[PDB]
Structures are given as structure tokens and as C-alpha cells.
PDB file of C-alpha atoms and ligand atoms in Angstrom:
ATOM      1  CA  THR A   1      18.096  -0.884   8.473  1.00  0.00           C
ATOM      2  CA  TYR A   2      15.414  -2.378   6.159  1.00  0.00           C
ATOM      3  CA  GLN A   3      15.624  -5.358   3.825  1.00  0.00           C
ATOM      4  CA  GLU A   4      14.946  -3.583   0.387  1.00  0.00           C
ATOM      5  CA  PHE A   5      14.642  -6.489  -2.092  1.00  0.00           C
ATOM      6  CA  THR A   6      16.466  -6.159  -5.257  1.00  0.00           C
ATOM      7  CA  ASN A   7      16.298  -9.687  -7.050  1.00  0.00           C
ATOM      8  CA  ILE A   8      12.838 -10.739  -8.155  1.00  0.00           C
ATOM      9  CA  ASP A   9      13.927 -14.579  -7.278  1.00  0.00           C
ATOM     10  CA  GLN A  10      14.821 -13.991  -3.741  1.00  0.00           C
ATOM     11  CA  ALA A  11      11.814 -12.185  -3.211  1.00  0.00           C
ATOM     12  CA  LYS A  12       9.384 -14.667  -4.535  1.00  0.00           C
ATOM     13  CA  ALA A  13      11.126 -17.222  -2.456  1.00  0.00           C
ATOM     14  CA  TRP A  14      11.011 -15.239   0.642  1.00  0.00           C
ATOM     15  CA  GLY A  15       7.231 -14.667   0.234  1.00  0.00           C
ATOM     16  CA  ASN A  16       6.731 -18.306  -0.465  1.00  0.00           C
ATOM     17  CA  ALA A  17       8.753 -19.127   2.759  1.00  0.00           C
ATOM     18  CA  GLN A  18       6.421 -16.907   4.686  1.00  0.00           C
ATOM     19  CA  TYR A  19       3.025 -17.838   3.023  1.00  0.00           C
ATOM     20  CA  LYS A  20       3.428 -21.653   3.932  1.00  0.00           C
ATOM     21  CA  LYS A  21       3.542 -21.046   7.711  1.00  0.00           C
ATOM     22  CA  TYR A  22       0.643 -18.941   7.624  1.00  0.00           C
ATOM     23  CA  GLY A  23      -2.113 -21.744   8.193  1.00  0.00           C
ATOM     24  CA  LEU A  24      -4.697 -19.822   6.809  1.00  0.00           C
ATOM     25  CA  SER A  25      -8.551 -21.123   6.769  1.00  0.00           C
ATOM     26  CA  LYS A  26     -10.390 -21.504   3.510  1.00  0.00           C
ATOM     27  CA  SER A  27     -12.772 -18.526   4.322  1.00  0.00           C
ATOM     28  CA  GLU A  28      -9.827 -16.294   5.006  1.00  0.00           C
ATOM     29  CA  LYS A  29      -8.450 -17.429   1.603  1.00  0.00           C
ATOM     30  CA  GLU A  30     -11.625 -16.672  -0.330  1.00  0.00           C
ATOM     31  CA  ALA A  31     -12.037 -13.277   1.588  1.00  0.00           C
ATOM     32  CA  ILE A  32      -8.388 -12.432   0.026  1.00  0.00           C
ATOM     33  CA  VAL A  33      -8.679 -13.592  -3.606  1.00  0.00           C
ATOM     34  CA  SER A  34     -11.903 -11.371  -3.354  1.00  0.00           C
ATOM     35  CA  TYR A  35     -10.246  -8.318  -1.874  1.00  0.00           C
ATOM     36  CA  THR A  36      -7.522  -8.184  -4.997  1.00  0.00           C
ATOM     37  CA  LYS A  37     -10.569  -8.422  -7.508  1.00  0.00           C
ATOM     38  CA  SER A  38     -12.328  -5.288  -6.083  1.00  0.00           C
ATOM     39  CA  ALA A  39      -9.639  -3.511  -3.853  1.00  0.00           C
ATOM     40  CA  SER A  40     -10.472   0.056  -4.562  1.00  0.00           C
ATOM     41  CA  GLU A  41     -14.346  -0.352  -4.098  1.00  0.00           C
ATOM     42  CA  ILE A  42     -13.586  -1.527  -0.514  1.00  0.00           C
ATOM     43  CA  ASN A  43     -11.175   1.012   0.138  1.00  0.00           C
ATOM     44  CA  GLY A  44     -13.009   3.486  -1.783  1.00  0.00           C
ATOM     45  CA  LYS A  45     -15.927   2.641   0.606  1.00  0.00           C
ATOM     46  CA  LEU A  46     -14.080   2.291   3.836  1.00  0.00           C
ATOM     47  CA  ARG A  47     -12.455   5.884   3.206  1.00  0.00           C
ATOM     48  CA  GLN A  48     -16.084   7.695   3.008  1.00  0.00           C
ATOM     49  CA  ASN A  49     -16.827   5.694   6.185  1.00  0.00           C
ATOM     50  CA  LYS A  50     -14.031   6.538   8.175  1.00  0.00           C
ATOM     51  CA  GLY A  51     -13.527   2.781   9.098  1.00  0.00           C
ATOM     52  CA  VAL A  52     -16.750   2.070  11.137  1.00  0.00           C
ATOM     53  CA  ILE A  53     -18.013  -0.961   9.932  1.00  0.00           C
ATOM     54  CA  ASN A  54     -21.024  -1.806  12.188  1.00  0.00           C
ATOM     55  CA  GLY A  55     -23.630  -0.865   9.313  1.00  0.00           C
ATOM     56  CA  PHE A  56     -22.543  -2.551   5.932  1.00  0.00           C
ATOM     57  CA  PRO A  57     -23.989  -5.221   3.739  1.00  0.00           C
ATOM     58  CA  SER A  58     -23.428  -8.937   5.186  1.00  0.00           C
ATOM     59  CA  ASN A  59     -21.100 -10.046   2.347  1.00  0.00           C
ATOM     60  CA  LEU A  60     -18.488  -7.234   3.426  1.00  0.00           C
ATOM     61  CA  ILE A  61     -18.814  -7.312   7.163  1.00  0.00           C
ATOM     62  CA  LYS A  62     -17.892 -10.865   7.047  1.00  0.00           C
ATOM     63  CA  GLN A  63     -15.222 -10.182   4.445  1.00  0.00           C
ATOM     64  CA  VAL A  64     -13.495  -7.191   6.278  1.00  0.00           C
ATOM     65  CA  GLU A  65     -13.792  -8.963   9.778  1.00  0.00           C
ATOM     66  CA  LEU A  66     -11.718 -12.128   8.039  1.00  0.00           C
ATOM     67  CA  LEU A  67      -9.268  -9.829   6.265  1.00  0.00           C
ATOM     68  CA  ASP A  68      -8.515  -8.245   9.878  1.00  0.00           C
ATOM     69  CA  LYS A  69      -8.444 -11.705  11.404  1.00  0.00           C
ATOM     70  CA  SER A  70      -5.852 -12.970   8.623  1.00  0.00           C
ATOM     71  CA  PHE A  71      -3.260 -10.737  10.180  1.00  0.00           C
ATOM     72  CA  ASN A  72      -3.255 -12.699  13.274  1.00  0.00           C
ATOM     73  CA  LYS A  73      -1.417 -15.394  11.053  1.00  0.00           C
ATOM     74  CA  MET A  74       0.359 -12.733   8.977  1.00  0.00           C
ATOM     75  CA  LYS A  75       3.503 -11.037  10.400  1.00  0.00           C
ATOM     76  CA  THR A  76       6.859  -9.995   8.896  1.00  0.00           C
ATOM     77  CA  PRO A  77       9.902 -11.457  10.612  1.00  0.00           C
ATOM     78  CA  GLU A  78      12.144  -8.504   9.605  1.00  0.00           C
ATOM     79  CA  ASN A  79      12.223  -4.816   8.891  1.00  0.00           C
ATOM     80  CA  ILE A  80      11.258  -4.479   5.549  1.00  0.00           C
ATOM     81  CA  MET A  81      10.742  -1.976   2.445  1.00  0.00           C
ATOM     82  CA  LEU A  82       7.569  -2.331   0.531  1.00  0.00           C
ATOM     83  CA  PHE A  83       6.700  -0.177  -2.688  1.00  0.00           C
ATOM     84  CA  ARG A  84       3.346   1.431  -3.906  1.00  0.00           C
ATOM     85  CA  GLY A  85       2.431   3.577  -7.131  1.00  0.00           C
ATOM     86  CA  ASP A  86      -0.368   6.220  -6.816  1.00  0.00           C
ATOM     87  CA  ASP A  87      -2.176   8.786  -8.984  1.00  0.00           C
ATOM     88  CA  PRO A  88      -2.589  12.422  -8.166  1.00  0.00           C
ATOM     89  CA  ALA A  89      -5.964  12.307  -6.644  1.00  0.00           C
ATOM     90  CA  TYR A  90      -3.948  10.631  -3.643  1.00  0.00           C
ATOM     91  CA  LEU A  91      -2.641  14.007  -2.684  1.00  0.00           C
ATOM     92  CA  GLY A  92      -5.919  15.597  -2.683  1.00  0.00           C
ATOM     93  CA  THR A  93      -8.698  17.082  -5.139  1.00  0.00           C
ATOM     94  CA  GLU A  94      -6.721  20.062  -5.859  1.00  0.00           C
ATOM     95  CA  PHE A  95      -3.804  18.178  -7.230  1.00  0.00           C
ATOM     96  CA  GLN A  96      -5.684  15.718  -9.303  1.00  0.00           C
ATOM     97  CA  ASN A  97      -5.532  18.190 -12.480  1.00  0.00           C
ATOM     98  CA  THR A  98      -2.627  20.102 -11.584  1.00  0.00           C
ATOM     99  CA  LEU A  99       0.184  17.675 -10.689  1.00  0.00           C
ATOM    100  CA  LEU A 100       1.403  16.989 -14.020  1.00  0.00           C
ATOM    101  CA  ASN A 101       2.636  19.322 -16.386  1.00  0.00           C
ATOM    102  CA  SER A 102       1.484  18.700 -20.174  1.00  0.00           C
ATOM    103  CA  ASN A 103       5.153  17.253 -21.166  1.00  0.00           C
ATOM    104  CA  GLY A 104       4.436  14.360 -18.810  1.00  0.00           C
ATOM    105  CA  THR A 105       6.570  15.768 -15.731  1.00  0.00           C
ATOM    106  CA  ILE A 106       5.569  17.303 -12.372  1.00  0.00           C
ATOM    107  CA  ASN A 107       4.750  20.911 -12.113  1.00  0.00           C
ATOM    108  CA  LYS A 108       7.271  22.546  -9.949  1.00  0.00           C
ATOM    109  CA  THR A 109       4.752  24.894  -8.114  1.00  0.00           C
ATOM    110  CA  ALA A 110       2.176  21.968  -7.685  1.00  0.00           C
ATOM    111  CA  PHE A 111       4.912  19.833  -6.188  1.00  0.00           C
ATOM    112  CA  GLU A 112       6.053  22.675  -3.585  1.00  0.00           C
ATOM    113  CA  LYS A 113       2.829  22.867  -2.334  1.00  0.00           C
ATOM    114  CA  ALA A 114       2.313  19.219  -1.979  1.00  0.00           C
ATOM    115  CA  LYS A 115       5.808  18.985  -0.283  1.00  0.00           C
ATOM    116  CA  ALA A 116       4.448  21.738   2.092  1.00  0.00           C
ATOM    117  CA  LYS A 117       1.019  20.266   2.906  1.00  0.00           C
ATOM    118  CA  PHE A 118       2.516  16.799   3.744  1.00  0.00           C
ATOM    119  CA  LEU A 119       6.302  16.902   4.593  1.00  0.00           C
ATOM    120  CA  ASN A 120       6.692  15.687   8.246  1.00  0.00           C
ATOM    121  CA  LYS A 121       3.126  15.010   8.785  1.00  0.00           C
ATOM    122  CA  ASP A 122       1.228  11.896   9.778  1.00  0.00           C
ATOM    123  CA  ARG A 123      -1.271  10.417   7.539  1.00  0.00           C
ATOM    124  CA  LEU A 124      -3.999   8.000   8.387  1.00  0.00           C
ATOM    125  CA  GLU A 125      -5.287   5.502   5.713  1.00  0.00           C
ATOM    126  CA  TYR A 126      -8.870   3.847   6.298  1.00  0.00           C
ATOM    127  CA  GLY A 127      -8.438   1.386   3.342  1.00  0.00           C
ATOM    128  CA  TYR A 128      -6.244  -1.500   3.335  1.00  0.00           C
ATOM    129  CA  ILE A 129      -3.090  -0.843   1.595  1.00  0.00           C
ATOM    130  CA  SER A 130      -1.763  -2.850  -1.230  1.00  0.00           C
ATOM    131  CA  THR A 131       1.919  -3.128  -1.849  1.00  0.00           C
ATOM    132  CA  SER A 132       4.620  -4.746  -3.469  1.00  0.00           C
ATOM    133  CA  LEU A 133       8.082  -6.356  -2.708  1.00  0.00           C
ATOM    134  CA  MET A 134       9.879  -4.555  -5.407  1.00  0.00           C
ATOM    135  CA  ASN A 135       9.088  -1.784  -7.623  1.00  0.00           C
ATOM    136  CA  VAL A 136       7.049  -3.956  -9.949  1.00  0.00           C
ATOM    137  CA  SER A 137       6.449  -2.847 -13.496  1.00  0.00           C
ATOM    138  CA  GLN A 138       2.606  -2.834 -12.953  1.00  0.00           C
ATOM    139  CA  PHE A 139       2.618   0.296 -10.939  1.00  0.00           C
ATOM    140  CA  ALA A 140       6.200   1.743 -11.165  1.00  0.00           C
ATOM    141  CA  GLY A 141       4.851   4.119 -13.789  1.00  0.00           C
ATOM    142  CA  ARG A 142       2.353   6.065 -11.849  1.00  0.00           C
ATOM    143  CA  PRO A 143       3.298   9.568 -10.828  1.00  0.00           C
ATOM    144  CA  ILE A 144       3.725   8.948  -7.154  1.00  0.00           C
ATOM    145  CA  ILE A 145       5.995   6.013  -5.704  1.00  0.00           C
ATOM    146  CA  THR A 146       6.074   5.453  -2.053  1.00  0.00           C
ATOM    147  CA  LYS A 147       8.543   3.436  -0.036  1.00  0.00           C
ATOM    148  CA  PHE A 148       7.176   2.105   3.273  1.00  0.00           C
ATOM    149  CA  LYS A 149       9.563   1.224   5.981  1.00  0.00           C
ATOM    150  CA  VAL A 150       7.863  -1.610   7.873  1.00  0.00           C
ATOM    151  CA  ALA A 151       9.125  -2.834  11.446  1.00  0.00           C
ATOM    152  CA  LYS A 152       9.816  -6.512  12.258  1.00  0.00           C
ATOM    153  CA  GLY A 153       6.895  -8.035  13.770  1.00  0.00           C
ATOM    154  CA  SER A 154       4.236  -5.736  12.106  1.00  0.00           C
ATOM    155  CA  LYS A 155       1.125  -6.935  10.401  1.00  0.00           C
ATOM    156  CA  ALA A 156       1.925  -7.733   6.655  1.00  0.00           C
ATOM    157  CA  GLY A 157       1.060 -10.625   4.528  1.00  0.00           C
ATOM    158  CA  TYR A 158       2.330 -12.168   0.944  1.00  0.00           C
ATOM    159  CA  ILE A 159      -0.798 -12.648  -0.577  1.00  0.00           C
ATOM    160  CA  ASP A 160       0.545 -13.403  -3.984  1.00  0.00           C
ATOM    161  CA  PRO A 161      -0.401 -17.190  -4.046  1.00  0.00           C
ATOM    162  CA  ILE A 162      -4.048 -16.270  -3.454  1.00  0.00           C
ATOM    163  CA  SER A 163      -4.484 -13.136  -5.635  1.00  0.00           C
ATOM    164  CA  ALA A 164      -6.474 -12.883  -8.818  1.00  0.00           C
ATOM    165  CA  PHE A 165      -3.255 -12.098 -10.979  1.00  0.00           C
ATOM    166  CA  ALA A 166      -0.189 -13.528  -9.623  1.00  0.00           C
ATOM    167  CA  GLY A 167       3.630 -13.010 -10.193  1.00  0.00           C
ATOM    168  CA  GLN A 168       3.426  -9.475  -9.091  1.00  0.00           C
ATOM    169  CA  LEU A 169       4.934  -9.709  -5.438  1.00  0.00           C
ATOM    170  CA  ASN A 170       1.753  -8.784  -3.731  1.00  0.00           C
ATOM    171  CA  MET A 171       1.721  -7.832  -0.151  1.00  0.00           C
ATOM    172  CA  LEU A 172      -0.926  -6.586   2.011  1.00  0.00           C
ATOM    173  CA  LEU A 173      -1.023  -4.311   4.997  1.00  0.00           C
ATOM    174  CA  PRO A 174      -4.137  -3.819   7.540  1.00  0.00           C
ATOM    175  CA  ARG A 175      -6.722  -1.156   7.419  1.00  0.00           C
ATOM    176  CA  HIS A 176      -6.617   2.053   9.436  1.00  0.00           C
ATOM    177  CA  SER A 177      -2.788   2.142   9.536  1.00  0.00           C
ATOM    178  CA  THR A 178      -0.802   5.372  10.186  1.00  0.00           C
ATOM    179  CA  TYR A 179       2.444   6.572   8.593  1.00  0.00           C
ATOM    180  CA  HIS A 180       4.781   9.521   8.901  1.00  0.00           C
ATOM    181  CA  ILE A 181       6.227  11.370   5.662  1.00  0.00           C
ATOM    182  CA  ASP A 182       9.857  11.696   5.884  1.00  0.00           C
ATOM    183  CA  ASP A 183      11.031  12.614   2.460  1.00  0.00           C
ATOM    184  CA  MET A 184       9.308  13.947  -0.762  1.00  0.00           C
ATOM    185  CA  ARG A 185      11.728  14.771  -3.590  1.00  0.00           C
ATOM    186  CA  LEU A 186      11.390  14.659  -7.422  1.00  0.00           C
ATOM    187  CA  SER A 187      12.959  11.717  -9.309  1.00  0.00           C
ATOM    188  CA  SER A 188      16.162  12.057 -11.471  1.00  0.00           C
ATOM    189  CA  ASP A 189      14.334  12.499 -14.953  1.00  0.00           C
ATOM    190  CA  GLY A 190      11.696  14.683 -13.175  1.00  0.00           C
ATOM    191  CA  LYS A 191       8.558  12.826 -14.062  1.00  0.00           C
ATOM    192  CA  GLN A 192       7.887  11.110 -10.531  1.00  0.00           C
ATOM    193  CA  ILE A 193       7.512  12.051  -6.887  1.00  0.00           C
ATOM    194  CA  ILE A 194       9.126   9.477  -4.564  1.00  0.00           C
ATOM    195  CA  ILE A 195       7.916   9.649  -0.918  1.00  0.00           C
ATOM    196  CA  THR A 196       9.593   7.819   1.934  1.00  0.00           C
ATOM    197  CA  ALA A 197       7.424   6.836   4.859  1.00  0.00           C
ATOM    198  CA  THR A 198       7.620   4.979   8.144  1.00  0.00           C
ATOM    199  CA  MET A 199       4.898   2.854   9.128  1.00  0.00           C
ATOM    200  CA  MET A 200       3.564   3.901  12.536  1.00  0.00           C
ATOM    201  CA  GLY A 201       1.641   0.764  12.916  1.00  0.00           C
ATOM    202  CA  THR A 202      -2.409   0.501  13.489  1.00  0.00           C
TER     203      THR A 202
HETATM  204  N1  NAD B   1      -0.742   0.465  -6.286  1.00  0.00           N
HETATM  205  C1  NAD B   1       0.038  -0.445  -5.996  1.00  0.00           C
HETATM  206  O1  NAD B   1       1.330  -0.200  -5.585  1.00  0.00           O
HETATM  207  C2  NAD B   1      -0.265  -1.983  -5.818  1.00  0.00           C
HETATM  208  C3  NAD B   1       0.729  -2.991  -5.271  1.00  0.00           C
HETATM  209  C4  NAD B   1       0.382  -4.239  -5.174  1.00  0.00           C
HETATM  210  C5  NAD B   1      -1.008  -4.798  -5.793  1.00  0.00           C
HETATM  211  N2  NAD B   1      -1.716  -3.747  -6.108  1.00  0.00           N
HETATM  212  C6  NAD B   1      -3.087  -4.327  -6.725  1.00  0.00           C
HETATM  213  O2  NAD B   1      -3.855  -3.532  -7.414  1.00  0.00           O
HETATM  214  C7  NAD B   1      -5.171  -3.413  -6.885  1.00  0.00           C
HETATM  215  C8  NAD B   1      -5.353  -2.265  -5.986  1.00  0.00           C
HETATM  216  O3  NAD B   1      -4.739  -0.978  -6.609  1.00  0.00           O
HETATM  217  P1  NAD B   1      -4.755   0.423  -5.801  1.00  0.00           P
HETATM  218  O4  NAD B   1      -3.629   0.103  -5.002  1.00  0.00           O
HETATM  219  O5  NAD B   1      -4.409   1.315  -6.906  1.00  0.00           O
HETATM  220  O6  NAD B   1      -6.008   0.557  -5.158  1.00  0.00           O
HETATM  221  P2  NAD B   1      -6.313   1.806  -4.084  1.00  0.00           P
HETATM  222  O7  NAD B   1      -7.782   1.430  -3.171  1.00  0.00           O
HETATM  223  O8  NAD B   1      -5.297   1.861  -2.875  1.00  0.00           O
HETATM  224  O9  NAD B   1      -6.688   3.230  -4.536  1.00  0.00           O
HETATM  225  C9  NAD B   1      -7.224   3.364  -5.829  1.00  0.00           C
HETATM  226  C10 NAD B   1      -6.874   4.572  -6.713  1.00  0.00           C
HETATM  227  O10 NAD B   1      -7.098   5.663  -5.761  1.00  0.00           O
HETATM  228  C11 NAD B   1      -5.998   6.410  -5.388  1.00  0.00           C
HETATM  229  N3  NAD B   1      -6.062   6.918  -3.832  1.00  0.00           N
HETATM  230  C12 NAD B   1      -5.392   6.439  -2.970  1.00  0.00           C
HETATM  231  N4  NAD B   1      -5.763   6.941  -1.905  1.00  0.00           N
HETATM  232  C13 NAD B   1      -6.513   7.992  -2.178  1.00  0.00           C
HETATM  233  C14 NAD B   1      -7.262   9.118  -1.423  1.00  0.00           C
HETATM  234  N5  NAD B   1      -6.842   9.116  -0.066  1.00  0.00           N
HETATM  235  N6  NAD B   1      -7.945  10.104  -1.913  1.00  0.00           N
HETATM  236  C15 NAD B   1      -8.169  10.038  -3.319  1.00  0.00           C
HETATM  237  N7  NAD B   1      -7.555   8.895  -4.187  1.00  0.00           N
HETATM  238  C16 NAD B   1      -6.770   7.950  -3.661  1.00  0.00           C
HETATM  239  C17 NAD B   1      -4.894   5.816  -5.803  1.00  0.00           C
HETATM  240  O11 NAD B   1      -3.824   6.403  -6.080  1.00  0.00           O
HETATM  241  C18 NAD B   1      -5.468   4.768  -6.856  1.00  0.00           C
HETATM  242  O12 NAD B   1      -4.930   5.457  -7.989  1.00  0.00           O
HETATM  243  C19 NAD B   1      -5.240  -4.761  -6.411  1.00  0.00           C
HETATM  244  O13 NAD B   1      -5.354  -5.646  -7.485  1.00  0.00           O
HETATM  245  C20 NAD B   1      -3.801  -4.868  -5.541  1.00  0.00           C
HETATM  246  O14 NAD B   1      -3.793  -6.157  -5.319  1.00  0.00           O
HETATM  247  C21 NAD B   1      -1.491  -2.546  -6.230  1.00  0.00           C
END
């Protein structure tokens, strides 16, 4: 199965053990601390351009190339579960202002439709994907939590040390990854959607 971390201290210690062996260059370091400052713009942008880079500003082509190069030194030694909060727009423009009932919970119709659109499908992401070793308090409050199951040996780095705001168990997966949506259910208390997905690599 997949190591789901449950203790904040073994998680931070396990990240630390991984980070010390990376042997990253100082320019790859600068490129990451950058990435965590303006993550959404960069993904926001890469989405609209369907991953093709050849024609961007020089600042970004040198940045994105370095980010992709980092992942040669950053690999997980075991199957691992990573987490992520998301807002409604993540499901599509038709879910942006329909997904939440006024009382803060999920609309039962909106969820069924989303369930149908996405259950048992693959999904391709052009942005990098930012995740966390546990369901940290910074993002656990968004209406959509995703658990990713990530196979031993995959590209995945603990970039918490070189991140703008640290102590948030920050992991990064590479751009242009693909994943398959296994489950989509409502939480116990009805205010969330818990999605479960397997990283198909890429
Ligand atoms: N959200 C998390 O689980 C998480 C985990 C660890 C670190 N971080 C940190 O937070 C910052 C990045 O947060 P982020 O992950 O929200 O940025 P993001 O680039 O992944 O997405 C930005 C916003 O757009 C939405 N979105 C994602 N895909 C979309 C799509 N295809 N169409 C329309 N909207 C879409 C997301 O729900 C999010 O609200 C960085 O500082 C990063 O280090 C976030």
C-alpha cells in the first residue's frame, strides 16, 4: 500500500532525510523558491499554452527548464500519499458558482454531475502540482481535497526547506502529469468532496 503520513514529526523528519541527498545546484534552488512565490501564475500560464514552452520570456524558460531538471535529483523511495486542496473552478467553469449550496455544503445535483464527468477518467495537468505530506491546515479547508497515490521511484520532491513559507510539509510533482480518478465521495459532514487518484506518471 501507500505510506499515508499521520504524524507531523515523522513527516518533517522524512522530508529532511530526502532533502539532504538531493545535491541541488544554487540556480535550481533559486528557481524553486521562485516557483512557490508565484505558483498559480506559472501554472495558470502553462495551462493556457498546453505545456509548450519554446516561446516564453527568458526568465521563465530558464526557470521551467531548471524546475524540470531538479526532478532528476528528486525521487521518492516509496509509495506515498500526497494531499491537496482545490476550489470549484478546478472542476470546470460550470461548477465555479454552482458547487456550493448557500449553507456552505455541497449541492447534491452539482456533485452528481461532477461525479459523472470525472469518475473513472484520466485527467492531464499542464501545471506543476503542489501538494503536502499530510492534509495541512492551510488547504484542508477548500471544498475539494485530493489524495494522490504516488508510486515508488516517481518524480516528487520535498521542497519545504527552499520555499517562501516553510513548515507546511510542501512537496512538488512535475508538470504534464496524468492521473486516473478512482473515487469521488462526499465527506462525513457533507461540506467537502474527497477525490482519490492514482498518479499515472509523466
Ligand atoms: N493547494 C495545495 O494543496 C497546496 C499544497 C502545498 C503547497 N501549496 C502552495 O500554495 C501555492 C499554490 O497553491 P495552488 O496549489 O492553489 O495553485 P494552483 O496553480 O494549483 O491552482 C490555483 C487555483 O486554481 C484552481 N485550479 C486548479 N486547476 C484548475 C483548472 N484546471 N482550471 C481552473 N482552476 C484550476 C485551484 O483549485 C486553485 O484554487 C504555492 O505557494 C504552493 O507551494 C498548495
